[PDB]
Structure 1
Amino acid sequence: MAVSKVMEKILRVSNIDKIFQTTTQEIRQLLKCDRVAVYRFNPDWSGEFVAESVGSGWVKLVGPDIKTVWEDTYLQETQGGRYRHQESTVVNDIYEAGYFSCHLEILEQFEIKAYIVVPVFAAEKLWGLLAAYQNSGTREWVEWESSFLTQVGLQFGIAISHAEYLEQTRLQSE
């Protein structure tokens, strides 16, 4: 077996897209929520949704023909917000959160009423965000839900780190 292929097998990251897809579904089922999504930052701290599980009837953000970019002004200004410092955000009702109109408009376009978002770190860098969304109504999230999502964020982060590691072994022999 080829070195890079044995590694891939040891680090458990054959096919990171399938990992994201199946895991977001499993989380969505556990949390009984309406969407679970993985969002990847661009160097300018804009970014896009790369994977999701989404319930019956809600707008889809990921797919063959779809591409959902969210350039968030606040996250761009701050280079990843509080998520840089490994903090999580828990919002039971977006209308009680004290947001600005233009941010609320984006949340409404995604049919979000309540959500959790946690960091996804790759190496020591903030790579993206993992979020769970309630679309049907407000929701009072509980600590086990947000601590678990945080724990999955760590899992996704390491998986991405393995993928970047393997990628960045670009053209060394052995």
Structure 2
Amino acid sequence: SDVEEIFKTTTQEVRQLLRCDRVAVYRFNPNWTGEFVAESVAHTWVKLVGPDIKTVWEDTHLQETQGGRYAQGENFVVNDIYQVGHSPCHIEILEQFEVKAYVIVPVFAGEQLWGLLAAYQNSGTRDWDESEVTLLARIGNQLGLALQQTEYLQQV
């Protein structure tokens, strides 16, 4: 898929921007499961887009909220998962993939929410400057605009 090529390049691009270890792009399914279709990670960590992904327990967040906050267009910034009071159930999943600090950005493409962008890297109780958060939400928007162009010019 030519569109996937763009995603795979964008994941790597934004990974360098926020100095993340891995960047996963979810795709909101019509059933709101939201699977990771494109992801990139440094060769020294673990991947996400793999058929051999073993998680402590399977968890979809996207159906329960059905986009919710992210569908509303609000960003979510997590300085630390133990600090904000995250669910221990999700924390165990997060820490299993070295996720202690992260920022959630919704990827609108077209008229509605297409995917989800996850940026993080073994930071712990770090901070996210708004000037860097706006850039991440900018990448998602730019991707959505591109995605629209590729949607037509792809043809069948």
TM-score (norm 1): 0.76
Runs of 4+ in 1 over 6 A off after TM superposition: 67-70
SS state at 2:115 partner: strand
Query: Does residue 122 in structure 1 map to residue 109 in structure 2?
Result: yes
Identity of aligned residues (%): 64
Aligned pairs for 1:5-84 within 5 A: 15-63=2-50, 65-66=51-52, 71-73=59-61, 75-84=62-71
**Structure 1 122/68 Cα, relative in aligned 2: closer, same or farther at 3 Å?**
farther
Q: What are the within-5 Å matches in structure 2 for residues 113-152 of structure 1? A: 113-152=100-139
Deviation at 1:33, TM superposition (A): 1.8
Cα root mean square deviation, aligned:
2.4
For the Cα contact (< 8 Å) 2:15–2:21, is it kept in 1?
yes
Unaligned runs of 5+ in 2: none
Contact 2:101 2:123 in 1 (8 A): no
Residues 129-162 of structure 1: per-residue CA shift (max 9 Å, x gap)? 1121122543211111110000000012123333
TM-score between both structures, scaled by the size of structure 2: 0.84
Partner in structure 2 of residue 105 of structure 1:
92
Distance change in 2, residues 1:67/1:128 (3 Å): farther
Instruction: Count residues in correspondence.
Output: 154
Distance in 2 between the 1:18 and 1:82 partners?
28
User: What letter matches 1:33 in structure 2?
Assistant: C
Can you give the 5+ residue segments of structure 1 that lack an aligned partner in the other structure?
Answer: 1-13
